[PDB]
Ligand binder design. Structure first.
Ligand SMILES: Cc1cc2c(cc1C)N(C[C@H](O)[C@H](O)[C@H](O)COP(=O)(O)OP(=O)(O)OC[C@H]1O[C@@H](n3cnc4c(N)ncnc43)[C@H](O)[C@@H]1O)c1[nH]c(=O)[nH]c(=O)c1N2
Length: 272
């Protein structure tokens, strides 16, 4: 009965359970951000199957009257694999974004470990050019030394970017080892993106940072339509509700699927 526990953080194992969970968030004035979980994705066949499963999700969400908003890791759809002379991740991402876009939806390219940052930001730029900044977004992680520079380099795209602290175990040659620096850099990324007038998703459960961002938005006259807070399903549900009740946009990341063990284990690891 790991599931009796994991149900807090994972919508369920089916597309149906995910849609039901988005519908519940929506009834509470909160948007959803769907994440298909998968573990075996280590072959071009399986990466493309995964992409097809994300597309089936997008169709089901659209059928259920939900604007598709889905986050994917490009490695899961073939990033770094060549199929007939083109990168499989880019090929599959195009299929997935085109389908989301047809239904007025949006895809976020999540950011993986440091080895995939350059390719992801190159691919993101390509895809923004093909589909528009209103339909594809990405993520920057405040623990990396390179992130402030990366954010500034994307300003010409006026891009939708989610700021996160960072999820991977990265060495000190790549990521600030001091949590104080990670947190200060997080504010810097959020504030520079907001000052540039780009749509910003403030993905954090750190209430001190949440309060400071509220302060910043107030002091700078930034509208509550210009950014949103984002949280993982099941973490600080009280803040999710409170921020929605105070007029902020809140969008909750909802993982689903049969392969939930690793995701669930990371939620357990991060228990305060
Ligand atoms: C919507 C969204 C989307 C993503 C990500 C986060 C979110 C919210 N992340 C993960 C992110 O990098 C970061 O690891 C987590 O958000 C945790 O960091 P915090 O900002 O919550 O602060 P921090 O880790 O400091 O935690 C702050 C507080 O939040 C609460 N909290 C956090 N985790 C909890 C838990 N498991 N159980 C109970 N309470 C908990 C506790 O109160 C804790 O003190 C991510 N990372 C990445 O590298 N690439 C990505 O694409 C993404 N995508």
């Amino acid at each position: 009965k790991m599931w009796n526990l994991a149900e807090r953080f994972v919508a369920g194992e089916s597309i149906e359970s995910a849609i039901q969970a988005v519908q519940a968030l929506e009834r509470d004035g909160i948007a959803g951000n769907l994440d298909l979980l998968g573990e075996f994705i280590d072959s071009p066949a399986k990466c493309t199957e995964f992409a097809d499963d994300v597309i089936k999700l997008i169709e089901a969400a659209h059928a259920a009257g939900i604007k598709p908003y889905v986050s994917i890791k490009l490695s899961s759809v073939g990033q770094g694999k060549d199929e007939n002379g083109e990168d499989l991740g880019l090929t599959n991402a195009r299929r997935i974004i085109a389908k989301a876009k047809e239904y007025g939806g949006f895809i976020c390219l999540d950011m993986e470990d440091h080895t995939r940052v350059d390719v992801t930001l190159e691919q993101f730029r390509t895809l923004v050019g093909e589909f528009g900044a209103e339909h594809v977004g990405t993520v920057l992680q405040s623990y990396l030394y390179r992130s402030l520079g990366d954010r500034a380099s994307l300003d010409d795209l006026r891009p939708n970017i989610r700021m996160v602290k960072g999820a991977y175990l990265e060495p000190a040659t790549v990521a600030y080892p001091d949590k104080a620096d990670v947190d200060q850099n997080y504010r810097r990324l959020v504030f520079q993106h907001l000052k540039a007038g780009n749509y910003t998703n403030v993905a954090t459960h750190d209430e001190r940072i949440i309060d400071d961002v509220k302060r910043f938005v107030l002091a700078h006259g930034i509208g509550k339509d210009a950014f949103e807070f984002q949280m993982l399903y099941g973490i600080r549900r009280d803040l999710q509700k409170q921020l929605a009740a105070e007029g902020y946009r809140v969008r909750v990341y909802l993982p689903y699927g049969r392969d939930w063990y690793a995701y669930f284990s990371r939620r357990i690891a991060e228990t305060p």
